[PDB]
Design a protein around this ligand. Sequence first.
Ligand SMILES: Nc1nc2c(ncn2[C@@H]2O[C@H](COP(=O)(O)OP(=O)(O)OP(=O)(O)O)[C@@H](O)[C@H]2O)c(=O)[nH]1
Ligand SMILES: Nc1nc2c(ncn2[C@@H]2O[C@H](COP(=O)(O)OP(=O)(O)O)[C@@H](O)[C@H]2O)c(=O)[nH]1
Ligand SMILES: [Mg+2]
Lengths: 250, 258
Amino acid sequence: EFTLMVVGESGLGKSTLINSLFLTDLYPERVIPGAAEKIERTVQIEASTVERLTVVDTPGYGDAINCRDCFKTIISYIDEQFERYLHDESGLNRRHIIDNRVHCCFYFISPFGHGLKPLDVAFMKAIHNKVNIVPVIAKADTLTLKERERLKKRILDEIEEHNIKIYHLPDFKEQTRLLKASIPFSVVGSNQLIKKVRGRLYPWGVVEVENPEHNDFLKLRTMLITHMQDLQEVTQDLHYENFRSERLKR
Amino acid sequence: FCFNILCVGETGLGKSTLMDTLFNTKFEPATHTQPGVQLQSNTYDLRLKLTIVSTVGFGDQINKEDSYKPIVEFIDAQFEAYLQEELKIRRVLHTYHDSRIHVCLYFIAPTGHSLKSLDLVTMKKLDSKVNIIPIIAKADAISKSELTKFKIKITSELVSNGVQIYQFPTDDESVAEINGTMNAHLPFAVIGSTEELKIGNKMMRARQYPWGTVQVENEAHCDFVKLREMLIRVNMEDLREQTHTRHYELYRRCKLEE
Ligand SMILES: Nc1nc2c(ncn2[C@@H]2O[C@H](COP(=O)(O)OP(=O)(O)OP(=O)(O)O)[C@@H](O)[C@H]2O)c(=O)[nH]1
Ligand SMILES: Nc1nc2c(ncn2[C@@H]2O[C@H](COP(=O)(O)OP(=O)(O)O)[C@@H](O)[C@H]2O)c(=O)[nH]1
Ligand SMILES: [Mg+2]
């Protein structure tokens, strides 16, 4: 059982990347609302389950003009899963128990700005003590190598000077070394096949998803497969126990 | 000759880069921490007295309900200063520098869906204030398979909400077909770059990725050539004329009705 949360501005290719990680179309009938409906659109929660994986999406995030309670619907869901597990752990049927606690949250940073918006800082500072945050740079094929390194160094500095507790990798040797150096991962996703390979077609060249010299798709996928046991371990031993002690304040 | 361009886009969407691409000359990036939307104006002498006004901090605040207000405030301030000129007894129209915005290039983030709610509201309240030309910023983020669908959804968004966008004049028969082509390509998929590379054997603005090099002046790569063809003496004066006879006339009707 693993639970992956997806948070980010609409239109960042989050659905495409998720369908690219496992080659599973999870949004066959999803409809995108018009710009008039996004004005007052609220944040909703959709959970898709495939096989022991659950992808928790948060459609509506950032679409509203006035983020009234943009984080509240997400924060309360994370706390709800901690509360349900808490009351099931304290129950008498601990044998048959479902662990829906969010083990990892992919947050999609826009590549079209200079760094990260205040919305990114507020959201991460709101959940970094509750979920393992893995920042990702959406639509990496819009950044040159020079532009890509400028954005990664800026995001990491802003993370440090805002004290963002993102998920950290632990300490074969070349795998861990190159994986840590590419954080934050700048990924490219695709459902198209193009002399045939998965990627995106432009008049001036073809981007390859599984090409590490083009984007960090393979690194993100490799990091998730290898650190999947550690992600849920930090969730159970750190984020859940902090919620449990904070719950006992009242 | 006075001509004033307004650039309205989210922070980092390439406003300064695109202006440098249009005129082949260098003209600072804003932060994302601005508590409100402001505007920066700079006038250049090139025959032509160009003024470039850019939004600062547009779209960065968590609450974006008051984003259109500073832009409308600035446009009205130019409408008001011109009205003050017509009401002077001993006026100096012949020597007055027209500061009214003659064109607004609205930068749309290449999301691939349609319009954001901030795009719909801001453009709807700039309808009767300025000649709006919608462009898809950083168009190299969209494959040609998606650009066709994206342009259709955007236009369907402007029509359904009654957004009044500028249309190049087809009344002049001497350049009606080429203006009919530019109107059919709206919104313009534009790409900008402040550095050139040797493609073929002519230095031209470009963006090089590990998988290819984008040619800015190549019509098959983006619609930048279409956007540059708005600087023709005929289309450039109509934007100045359509501002005075339509948008500025609307400002007078409101100031007189009281
Ligand atoms: N992918 C892509 N990147 C671009 C394009 N144009 C510019 N850039 C990059 O994006 C960065 C932003 O450029 P700016 O011109 O400063 O953007 P801006 O809208 O003026 O930013 P502010 O003035 O602070 O609001 C530039 O440094 C370029 O490296 C483009 O057409 N496509
Ligand atoms: N440039 C770029 N565009 C992408 C990528 N992945 C998806 N897209 C495009 O982005 C548009 C919307 O993406 P989507 O997956 O629906 O974004 P979502 O709103 O987060 O679900 C689609 O037209 C995709 O073709 C990518 O890696 N790079
Ligand atoms: Mg700029």
